[PDB]
Each structure stands twice: as structure tokens, then as C-alpha cells.
Amino acid sequence: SPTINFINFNQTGTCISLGTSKGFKIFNCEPFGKFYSEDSGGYAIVEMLFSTSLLALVGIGLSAARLRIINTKKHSIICEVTFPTSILSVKMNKSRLVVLLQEQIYIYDINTMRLLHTIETNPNPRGLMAMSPSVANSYLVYPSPPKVIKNGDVIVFNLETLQPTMVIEAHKGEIAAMAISFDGTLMATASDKGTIIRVFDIETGDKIYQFRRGTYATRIYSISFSEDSQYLAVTGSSKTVHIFKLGHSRHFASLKLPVETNSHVMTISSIGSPIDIDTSEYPELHEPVMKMVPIRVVSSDGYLYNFVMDPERGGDCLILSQYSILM
Amino acid sequence: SPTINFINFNQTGTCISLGTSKGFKIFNCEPFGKFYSEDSGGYAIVEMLFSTSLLALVGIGLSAARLRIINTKKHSIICEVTFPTSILSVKMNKSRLVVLLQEQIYIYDINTMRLLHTIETNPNPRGLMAMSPSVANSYLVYPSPPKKNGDVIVFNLETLQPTMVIEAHKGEIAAMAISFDGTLMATASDKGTIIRVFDIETGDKIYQFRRGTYATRIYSISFSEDSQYLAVTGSSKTVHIFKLGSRHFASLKLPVETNSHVMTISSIGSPIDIDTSEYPELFEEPVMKMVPIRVVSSDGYLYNFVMDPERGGDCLILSQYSILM
Amino acid sequence: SPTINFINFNQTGTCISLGTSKGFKIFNCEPFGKFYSEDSGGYAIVEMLFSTSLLALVGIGLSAARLRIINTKKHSIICEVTFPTSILSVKMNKSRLVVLLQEQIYIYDINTMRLLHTIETNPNPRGLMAMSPSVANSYLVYPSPPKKNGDVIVFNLETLQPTMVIEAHKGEIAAMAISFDGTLMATASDKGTIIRVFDIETGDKIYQFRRGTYATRIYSISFSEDSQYLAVTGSSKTVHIFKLGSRHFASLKLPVETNSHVMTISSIGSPIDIDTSEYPELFEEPVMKMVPIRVVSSDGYLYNFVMDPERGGDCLILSQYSILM
Amino acid sequence: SPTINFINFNQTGTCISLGTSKGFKIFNCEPFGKFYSEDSGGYAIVEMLFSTSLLALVGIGLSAARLRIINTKKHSIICEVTFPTSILSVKMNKSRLVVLLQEQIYIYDINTMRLLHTIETNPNPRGLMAMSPSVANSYLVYPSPPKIKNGDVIVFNLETLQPTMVIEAHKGEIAAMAISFDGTLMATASDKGTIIRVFDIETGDKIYQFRRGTYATRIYSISFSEDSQYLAVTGSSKTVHIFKLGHSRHFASLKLPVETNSHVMTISSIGSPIDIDTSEYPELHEPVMKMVPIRVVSSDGYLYNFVMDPERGGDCLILSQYSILMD
């Protein structure tokens, strides 16, 4: 079992990208399967578009600075670009491509692949961004800390016109995680203490909802919206995943992984559209079928966990099944 | 407690073959006991014939490519054979020995050890094959993906020629098994919701079963000795039973306290009599006919369940013994 | 007159490929003439595509194992590939290149020249196959004798996977052919009395024809372009015609003065019009439509017969041209 | 095309044995096919029983002296017998095994394989023999030249291992001899091949006398039909004559195609009458009439099929032609 260095969903949440120390793999979610794989080398960044057989591959250090775009269906190379320093994050929509270094942001047109803009920002060792995947509201947000209280300043940048729109005074402390909804309407931010989750409306700039997370301060790994912006998912070092309902404070529903799971695991999640599930097979505790929101939680140890949430009841969520990635 | 790497029944379901990173062990089912053990090294595949003191040893990486056949009664080594790639699966009957690799299938005569035929197949990353254990209808079935996804090649080991090709499923095949008499074949798709049972002689689809209301992958399928029941184990920690006389006939619910990071297989035995007086709390006619079901998981526990042949339903657990100890 | 070693039509029946003990020749059918010739050496297998200046060269023993692909217009060699055993047969379509050995079948991409797949088959000492020349329905068939005698494996060249197995005949297979569109299949046993036509899509027996009242082995089978007629050639110095619309439709009787130590192949072409004025002495309307039939024999003579699509019966002979001269 | 050194039918005429310079082959007649083959080396004598998977192989020199008997179904060796001199002929029935050297005849029991008898005969450079294949009338006949009394033949009974009578067959040396299937008759011919005589082995009286050809020419082999109706002689004239024993001049004659090389050994056999379709074959009409089939194989490696009209006789039509080498 080789070590894995990178996991993320696609922009719709129906696929899996993964990077090992020996290669990368691509999975699927509902009819689970292994679409692609190569045992080329160490990969640190494997990001995919809305299917479409387009990938961004960054070597473990193929150096960490180099970025390679590969079409998996054609097994060809669209392009190859180098950077002076190691790449920290890569994100895409169907219009723009963004590469972030520790102090620089590069924006590329996805089609022509020519460089469009460059932003000189204050250092971001954590490689934090958030990209709206829709071209109607294509926005990029990146933190702007003072260069050495106003440490949690974030810059709202419009990719369409390549000009910033506004500056949001998000938090007092440094930003730890950022997420933009599918339509590019909302943005959610998390401080380094992970106690307060704040979501802002990107066009107006007003803070709409504020969530309290857990009991004591602890690190936050990632944030992600639902497809319909109904729920927000956060995962932290407490080995617990919280769901906040944006249909409008305290977390709406909580995901407790099995006890045998290691505590030192990076956990990312995703929320899918509600589906029909049979209550005859699963004693939820009864009509034969009821809609339950499926949640997929893949951890850095290499396992996938499927949960269901009742939108009215909420509460602690039942776990249906567990696969094992890399097997 | 060393980690285990291989767990499997024998061709009759009356034994447990288990190989650890330190050695291998051979158990029994009804009179539970430790028949044999050796602390030699890491073993990846330990396959046994119908008792008869015959074993096949595959090293964890003894390499994974190398295959060794030993006799436990005489403590001797029959032969050793190497392969260009890692060994993925091995199955045996009283006439033929077959070794499956990533893209090749090797067929051996179990008596002489001479090579008989080699099949060039499209890649099988899951190491999937199924063998009829009876020499009367000695068949081999393996999937044929395109290089039309669930094509299964019914290969006749008796004359070393394929017999027919069945379009089993539209998607990838996940698990295949052949009955004890070699008459029927069962397969499950990669989405693990529909079970299809084929007549290996003609290829007609006979039975179709529903299972796995949500996305729970199917791992293993097994027939009973009389082929009356079909057992499917998935990743949902629940085992379904289908009757070959649609909806499942009976279900197995492992206790919740068990480790969830486990791989579970199962096998159904011939009906036996159980004593009520031995079990005062649960299951309380001094003796009743109940079909025994044995489920072993990778965490090292053997579970015994019993089902009422008429009522079915959720099955009780009589016992839970501890392998590796 | 150096002895010839190989005779074959092209995939359409409008050309002649012939190989001598001294070189190879390429003829034509309707305007009979010598298209090409080379005095290089002995050639045992000369196969041509649909014109396109592409040839397959196999040495007599260039050895029998080596295969050379040459372009006659550019006078250059595309590639040369060797094989462990002697080459038994070669067939082509516009997308795939197939080389058959005694126990193996090699499949190549006719464009990239890269090896695609290799099939392990039971020994075929006669070098038998049949290949569909149309890329749309590119199917390959080859016999599968036991190591159940007339089993032929239907192999899909497009996806490189077998599709189905048909129990063609109870005895050993003697000759096979596939129509131009790759839809139908024809087989003949070693008895030479029964001709069976199969549908590749389903596998059903479509037609059954009677032939060869005595022991005359069948040598070659060929479909017409429109698949209206099927011609079989044997060792009896007679060629029968069957209509795919029981008893044979028409028959060809070679002249008695010809050599008897001959192997004749045939290929039925598209119907054409013949001039009656050119032939006053035989067959006496100025012109009438007549289906041409071309029979070339190993003695070095090409024959042209014509059959009336309504009357059938014995076919008149128009011309007898001398190949190799 | 390898050089072939030996061709013989089985005792029933339904099979073909053959030996090349590289190995031996076994064919069949009605459903023609290659039952067996073996690429060992030069084989000089290949004799077979009534099918039953029993063969006798004599190497060209496996020296010419050595005799090896093999079961082809089991691919095993029964026994090997060595002799001081080269073997000239071997014939079998389901009871006895006979080995001829130039001056010695050895008789073995086919079952227990123990030696039974040995006859010291005057030299036979041509290795001539005729052996009855039926155990009810197991007889052996061999020539007895002096050391005018040249064509004397010794009638030897294999059952009791004693000579029965001496036949004063011909004035000159005997050239060929054969016995009917039931062991009742015997036919011999002198080295001139002008007179064919038939003697009854029971009494010794000459029954039939046939004239063959006009000028003295060599004779290769003589063979009866299975029903003892006809007798077949083959010679250097590239022509095969058939004499009707239902009772002088040959009843019907077989002419090979003119292309055939004239320096070819030819052995023939007559089969049981069967039905043929006159609709397909313009015999020049009832749809079917019974035609007696004759199979003629030549040393060049070809087989010829003729048909004989028992009433009309005359020159026989030829239906088909194969190749025994290659296929």
C-alpha cells in the first residue's frame, strides 16, 4: 500500500482524483470504478475538470515546480509549463486555469493556454484559494495578510475582466480554508482556530451566516459546498465532520467515523444530490423509500465512507458502506 | 497478533485456510481446532484441496511470482514453479491446477505437474476466476474485457478448449462462482445490485436477484453444497442469502463492535442439528435442523450463523471464535 | 517454365496474385494482363490488399518464418517481421494484418505496424482461417479442435475479444470463408458432403447444401461480392455453385485435356455483359448479362466461365489464358 | 516433399500406412484424415493390424535389422526385437507375427510375443510373402527356390506350425503372392508377369489361370478383394488390371492419368460395392447404381479413386485424386 499525498473531488463531486508516491489514479462515485491510472512517479497535485479527460499533474519533486497538462483519453500532452518555485495549488473551471505559488498567482486561459494575468500577493505558505467553477460568476479569492489586527483580509478577484472587485475583512486571524459555491454566489472562510465559520455573499460583500464549530479550537482541513448550496461541509482534526445548513450557528448534522480509524488522517468530504434509498434494507429508525442526502468522505489513509443525512431530522448520520481505495 | 494476508475456505466449506505475514494456519469449522501451522514467513495465497494434505504457497513478496506446492503430512515439497508476473489467484480440483496472472492463465495437471495449456486473456486487475470443483463437469470461467464488458469465457479444462461465450453483464464483472456440481454459474456486476445465474451448459439466464439498495460493492459469491442457497458478501457488513428454488431469502448482520476495516467471505454447509440447552440466552424441541453459515473476516474472527429453512429472515449467531489464537 | 507455389485472388476477385519458385507475379482479370513481376527468389505466400500497391511476402524456406511487407510502386519495404515457426497463412483487410502459425495467430494494425494481440490456439496444420475484408464488421474466425471437433472461434478484431463459439460440424473443419460484408460464414467438413452457412451475429444455421456424392475433399470456398452465390472447389476437377437465395445451382467442368495434378481456386465476380460476336464458334442477342467465374489452377492456367442467373446448369468456357508466360 | 519408402493398406483396405525418409504417417479411406504421424526418422517398413492401434516400425538403417512394435494410442513401446540381418517383410494377423529375413523366417505370437518357430529357407532377395489374416484359416506361404523346380512355394500352417503341402507353382522364380481374406485361395506370378495362377490352399489344385499383358513386364503387388470376388495386379506398365474370380483376359483395367511418372510403385485395393449418384457423374440412367471402389496409391504420393461396373467392366472412370504427402 503506497502512501497517498493528494485527494480531491472534481468540480461536481462525482469523481475522485488521487496521487500516490508511485502514480495517480482516477475513480468514479456512483457506479464505482477505476477509470484511469499510471505508475509514472510521485504526484503531489492531481486536479481534474468536469470529466472531459483533462488533468493537471505536478511531480512530487517532474519537479514540484513543473506543471503538466495531460489528456487521459488521448494519452497525449497538451502542454508543459515550469515555474520558478514549487506549486502549492491548482484549480480550474471551464474558462480559466489558476496556478498558485507561495507569493505569486498565475492565471491561464483554459482553451488558448496563453498567460492572461499575474498577481503579486503577500506570502501564502498554506496554498489557499477558492475558485468558482461556473463561467457566469467566475471569481477567484485569495488571502492578503499584512507583510512584516487585520490579518484575515481576503481579495475578491474577478477572472473574467482580470480586475479585483472588493476586499473582504473576513477574520481577525489568518485564513485557514476557503470555499466557493458551484454558481460562484457565496464564499466561506475559516480562521486558523477553526472556531468560527463565516460565509460571505461575494457580490454584495455582506456576511450572511456565521457558524460555531465544535467546542474547542482545532485545525480545519477543507470546506466544500453542496451542489445546490443547501449544506456546507467542514472536516477537522477532531476526526469529526460537521454539516452546516445554509437553508436559513450550531452544526446541523455531524459525521462520526468508525472508532478504529486513525486520528491523524486528512479527511475531505463532498455532498451529493438527494437520492431514493430503501428503508426495508436499512432500518433507519417507515415508508419503503425516503430521500436521504448521500455524503462521501475519503480520508488520507485510503478509505471511502458513505453516509446519509435526513434533511428534516439531521442529527448523527448513519454509515452505509466502506470501500478501500488502492484496492 | 501478526496481520493476516489470505483467508479462504476449502472446496467443501469445512476448513479455513489462512496465511499471515509470519506463517499460515489451517482450521476446521464444526469441531473448531488448529489442524496445522508453520511460522515460516509471509504467505500471500494458501489454497487447499479437498483435505488430502495438499497445499499451494505463494510468497508475500518466497516471492509473489513463485508458487510452491507442499504436502503437510509428509512435510515435503512437491515442486516449485515461477511466473513472469505476480500470482493473483489459484484454484484447484481433483484433476486440474490453474494459476491466474495479470494477463495469462496457466493450466496444470494436478497429478503429473506437467503444463497443459496457456490462455492469453485481456487484463484482469482483480484476479477473478471461478472453477468447477467436480471432475465430472470440469469447467473454468474467466472474464473477457474488451481491449460488451461482462463477457465470461467458459473454458473446458477436460479437453482444453473453450465451449461458449456468455454476455453476462453490461458493466464490469465483480465476482464469479461455480456450483459444486459444475452445472450453474453466478456473476455480479461492478455496481453490485443485480445477481445473474447462468446454466453453464446452454447459457440461458435462469435467476436474477436484487441486493445492495445503495452503492455497496459485492466481494464474494458462493454456492451451497446442494446449490440450494447462494451467499453474497459485500462491503456493507451484511451478508445476503438467495434461494435457488428477486428478494433476498435471509440476511446476516455481524455485531456492530467488530472492526469495519475488514474483508468478509462466507460459505454455506449441509444442514445440521444444534442443541438448545447449550445456548440458554439466545435461541430460547431440544434439537432443530438449521442450515449453518460460516463467515470469516480479515480481523481474525470466525462467525457461525444458522437459518431456519422455512422462515429465513435475519439469522442468529451461535458463536464467534478467534483465529490466530 | 518455373514451377509456381502460390495462387490467390484479391479480396474482391478482380486481381490475381501468383508466386513462382523464381519470383512473384501480379495479374488482372477482365483486361487480362501482367501488372507486375520480380525475379527475386522463391515466394510461398503472396497476399495483396484492395489494389493499393501493398504486398505480403513470405519466403519459401527470405525463409518461411519471415514476413516482408513491400510496396510495388515505391519499390521499398515497409517492415520485416520474423516468427518462431513457419508462416501458414496471411490475410488482410483495410485495418488489420493477420499472421497465422501452427499454434499461434498474430494480429497487427495495418497502419502503425504495431503488434496488437496474440491468440494461443490448438494446432492447425492446414493453416486455415477466414477473415472479413470489411472494416465495419471486422470479424476473424479460426478452428478450435480439442487437444466437439468443428468448433470455430469467432474473434472480433475491432475490440480484440472473442464473441461467440458455434458448433459447426461434428468432424474436422476443412474450409472456411466469410462474405465481403462480414455478415455470413461458410464451413465445410472433411467429408466434403455438407456445406453449412452461419450468421455471425446470431450463430444460427442459415443454409445447408449437398455436394460431392463421392469422396472428394473440399479445398476452397468463396463468396460472391453480393453474396448471392457460393463456390466450392474440390479435388474432383469440378466446381459447384450454390445460390443463397439443397441441390447445387450450377457446375463447372474443366476440359479433360488439362493436367489432373491441379489445385483450383475460384472467385465469382459481379455480373457483366459479354459480346456474342467475339465467340461465333461457341454459344451460337448481341450482348447479354452473364455472371463471370474465374478459376485459376496450379498448373498455370486461368479460366473464365459464365453462368446464366436464371437457367444455371453447366457453364460455358470463354477463355483460357496462360499465366506465367 | 520427403521421399517415401513404404505404402501399404491394412488387412481390411480401410486404412493407409506410409513411411517417409523423416517419419511415418497413418491415414484413413472413407472419411479421409490423418489419424497419426511421427517425425522420428527414416522408416522402411510400417505394418498395421486391423486398426486396434498396433504398429510395426522398421528403420531404414532404428536399424533395418531392428524391429520395434508401438501402440499409437498409448504412445508406448511394447517391445523391440533385433535380428542378425536386415528385415525384408513383416505381416500380421490378430494371432501371429511374422518376420522375414533374406534366408530366415521368424514367427511370433502377437499376444504373448514369445518366439514360436523358425524356418531356414533358401535365399529370398525380394522378401516375398503372403499371409492369411483370419485366425480360422491361419496360413503362411513363402517361395522355395533351389540351392525345373524354381517356382516352388511352401504352404505353411501357422496354427500347428507345420508345412501342409508343396505347390509346384511356376517354372521360373515367383514374383508376387497374395492370400484372400478368409485364407482360402492363393495367387502367384512369375518374374515375367505374363501368367497369373490361382491355387486353392486347401487341396493345392490350380483353380484359375489368368494372362496379364502381352510382353513380359514386372509385377509389383497382388491383392484380393475382401469378398474374394476380384483380384488386382499392378505392374510397370503404369496400368492396373482387375481379374474377376466369380468364374484369362483381365475383366477391367485401370489407366492412370498420362501425367503420372511411369517409374512409380503402385499398390491397390478393392472395397465393398457402395451406392454412387449417377446424376452427378455422367457415367454414360437410374439415379444410383452400385459401383465397386478401387483405391490406387503411387510411390510419388498421390491417391486415385476409380469405380468398376461389375457387369460392364472395361476401362474404369476416375473420380477424384488426393495427395498423401502434405495434404
Numbering used by the authors:
A (entry chain A): 5 to 65, 70 to 156, 222 to 321, 409 to 445, 458 to 499
B (entry chain E), C (entry chain C): 5 to 65, 70 to 155, 223 to 320, 409 to 447, 459 to 499
D (entry chain D): 5 to 65, 70 to 155, 222 to 321, 409 to 445, 458 to 500
Reproduce passages from the article:
Atg18 belongs to the protein family of β-propellers that bind polyphosphoinositides (PROPPIN). The corresponding primary structure contains a series of conserved WD40 repeats forming the 6 or 7 blades of a β-propeller fold.
In an effort to improve the helical order, we imaged the previously characterized Atg18-P72A/R73A (PR72AA) mutant that has lost its ability to interact with Atg241. The helical symmetry unit is illustrated with alternating blue/white colors (pitch: 100 Å, number of units per turn 5.1; helical rise: 19.4 Å, rotation 70.0°). In fact, the T-interface buries the PI3P/PI(3,5)P2 FRRG binding interface and shows direct competition between PIP binding and tube formation. Similarly, Atg18 phosphorylations in loop 7AB can be expected to affect the stability of the tubular assembly, in particular, as the higher resolution structure of Atg2-binding deficient mutant Atg18-PR72AA tubes suggested an increased rigidity over Atg18-WT.
